[PDB]
């Protein structure tokens, strides 16, 4: 089912992303923890995608653009510093 | 480590309310890494609980304690 | 002092706001709780009035307008359709 | 009862980026109403806490286990 091979995409990556983490700061994750996560990234997207839209069409625009994007981090200086750094470096190449 | 453009694409037309909509190239390119750290604050402040609540690893008990805090910050 | 009395202003209104509320379901709030409210009212403004900002100028304006407003409302779907119903009738008058 | 346009205009203007900005008429008679329900929405959510945990009025310790989800409703 599309949905579930999305899921399960996302779930595998999140898995990669803890194991990580797991190691940089040798502390475990439990299955049911990872599968969290990847429940909560998957919802997570649903709000990316809505606000994007909105945030593009409140500019009159049908393609979201990188300002969208920012506009996302805008609630946090340090995630809005971190998105603004890697859209540069995005623009670059 | 990360997610590949492709499925983030999927994952965002997913949602969109309207068919016109489309996601530029630079944009997808920043959703990747949006979504990567988002990720990562999840569970790098889930290990913070753990030690604090001197655990042994992060079960959902001490994720679920963080949750709120984490999605006010996105 | 400027923001003293402006708190002071939002407190007194949470005030009344919250009797309203204590005699429609019979239930008593703290004094400690009205002001925990009022604080939280207070802060909550810095926020709007940010988002509010970005949220005109994302569409490349300097005067917030409705649009803008609704925007703040986006995020639960009984919100954005009571604020929408004010909207309409505030463009009534 | 409410909030008044002023009060609101001042509260909104203490904490714009740029002195340019401004806000009409209507956007500000809007945020009046939002203020309300913001409000409203604590002191309802705090006195279901209170009713849930069985408590004779709502204190501090109520409201607070209501807040997240408000915020992020909000």
Known sequence: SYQQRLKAAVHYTVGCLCEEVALDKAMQFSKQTIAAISELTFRQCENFAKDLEMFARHAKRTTINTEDVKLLARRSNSLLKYITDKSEEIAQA | ?74
């Open chain 2, 1 to 74: 480590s990360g997610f590949r453009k492709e499925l983030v694409s999927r994952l965002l037309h997913l949602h969109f309310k309207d068919d016109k909509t489309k996601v530029s190239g630079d944009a997808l390119q920043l959703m990747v890494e949006l979504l990567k750290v988002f990720v990562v604050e999840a569970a790098v402040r889930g290990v913070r609980q753990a030690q604090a609540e001197d655990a042994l690893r992060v079960d959902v008990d001490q994720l679920e304690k963080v949750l709120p805090q984490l999605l006010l910050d996105f």
